[PDB]
C-alpha cells in the first residue's frame, strides 16, 4: 500500500534537499533579474515556501515515482530540512524561516528525525511539512503547536460576538464566552494545512458603542485539546499536498495539541 519514507537520518538523508538537483527557493520571476536573498528570504517566510517544498516533493514523485528510492530519500531529506528548520524556529522563535532553514546549525541534511524530532512545531510556514514529517515518522506521537504560533486571525464577526454586534445592536460591554469553529485554512494555508478547522474557545469582553463600533477583548484558546493530523483535517492547498503525500506514504495519524491562549484585541464597526 503506502510507501515508507525513511525517517530523516544522517544515514539515509541525501546530502541535500532535492538531492541538490532542486532547492527550495523563491520563484524564478522572469525579467526580475538575479534572485536576491531578500526575495528568497521573504519567500521562506511565506507559506509559499511550504507549498513549494511540498510541490517539489509532489513534482519529484510525479517525475520519479513515489516508490523510487531516490524519491523516498528526497522526501525524507527534504522534509528533514523542514523539520530541521522548524526545530530551529521552535528553538529560536522569532527568527525568520529563511534563517532557521538555512543556518542550520545542525546541517539540515544531517537531520535525524528519531533524535531530533520535536513534539512542538513552530506553527511557522515550515510546520505543515514538519506535520507531515510527524505523520511519516512520528509513530503517532502527539505534537503541539502553540495556539499563539498558528497565526490565528480571529474575526469576532464570525463568532457569537457577531450576534452581540450584528444587529442585536446592543450597546455596552458584554461577556463573551463561546466556542467557534475556526477554519484556519480559510486564511492561513499553513495552519490550515495541518490544523485546518479548529475549534476555539474565546472568553472576553465585547464592547459595542452605539455607533456600531465594537472591540472584542478576549482570550482565544483551542476548544479542542488537540487536532488530528490526517487527510480529513488538512485544509487548504498545502493541506491538500499533505493529503496527497500522506496518501502515498506510510505514516501514522497523530494529534496536534493546540495549547496556549492568545489574547486578542479585535475591533470593528457594525
UniProtKB/Swiss-Prot annotation:
The keyword Amino-acid biosynthesis does not apply. InterPro entries: Colicin_M (IPR028056). Colicins are polypeptide toxins produced by and active against E.coli and closely related bacteria. This colicin requires TonB for its uptake. Keywords: Antibiotic, Antimicrobial, Bacteriocin, Plasmid, TonB box. GO terms for biological process: defense response to bacterium; killing of cells of another organism. A motif (TonB box) lies at residues 1-8. This is Colicin-M.
Amino acid at each position: 500500500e503506502t510507501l515508507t519514507v525513511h525517517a530523516p537520518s544522517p544515514s539515509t538523508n541525501l546530502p541535500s534537499y532535492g538531492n541538490g538537483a532542486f532547492s527550495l527557493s523563491a520563484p524564478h520571476v522572469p525579467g526580475a533579474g538575479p534572485l536576491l536573498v531578500q526575495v528568497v528570504y521573504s519567500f521562506f517566510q511565506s507559506p509559499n515556501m511550504c507549498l513549494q517544498a511540498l510541490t517539489q516533493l509532489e513534482d519529484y514523485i510525479k517525475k520519479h515515482g513515489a516508490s523510487n528510492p531516490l524519491t523516498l530519500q528526497i522526501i525524507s531529506t527534504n522534509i528533514g530540512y523542514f523539520c530541521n528548520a522548524d526545530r530551529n524556529l521552535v528553538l529560536h522563535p522569532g527568527i525568520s524561516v529563511y534563517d532557521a532553514y538555512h543556518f542550520a546549525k545542525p546541517a539540515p541534511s544531517q537531520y535525524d528525525y528519531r533524535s531530533m524530532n520535536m513534539k512542538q512545531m513552530s506553527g511557522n510556514v515550515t510546520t505543515p511539512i514538519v506535520a507531515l514529517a510527524h505523520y511519516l515518522w512520528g509513530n503517532g506521537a502527539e505534537r503541539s503547536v502553540n495556539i499563539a504560533n498558528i497565526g490565528l486571525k480571529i474575526s469576532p464577526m464570525k463568532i457569537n460576538q457577531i450576534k452581540d454586534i450584528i444587529k442585536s445592536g446592543v450597546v455596552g460591554t458584554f461577556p463573551v464566552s463561546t466556542k467557534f469553529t475556526h477554519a484556519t485554512g480559510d486564511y492561513n494555508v499553513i495552519t490550515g494545512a495541518y490544523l485546518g478547522n479548529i475549534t476555539l474557545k474565546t472568553e472576553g469582553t465585547l464592547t459595542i458603542s452605539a455607533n456600531g463600533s465594537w472591540t472584542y477583548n478576549g482570550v482565544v484558546r483551542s476548544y479542542d485539546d488537540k487536532y488530528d493530523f490526517n487527510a480529513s483535517t488538512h485544509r487548504g492547498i498545502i493541506g491538500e499536498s499533505l493529503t496527497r503525500l500522506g496518501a502515498m506514504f506510510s505514516g501514522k495519524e497523530y494529534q496536534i495539541l493546540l495549547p496556549g491562549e492568545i489574547h486578542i484585541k479585535e475591533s470593528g464597526k457594525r
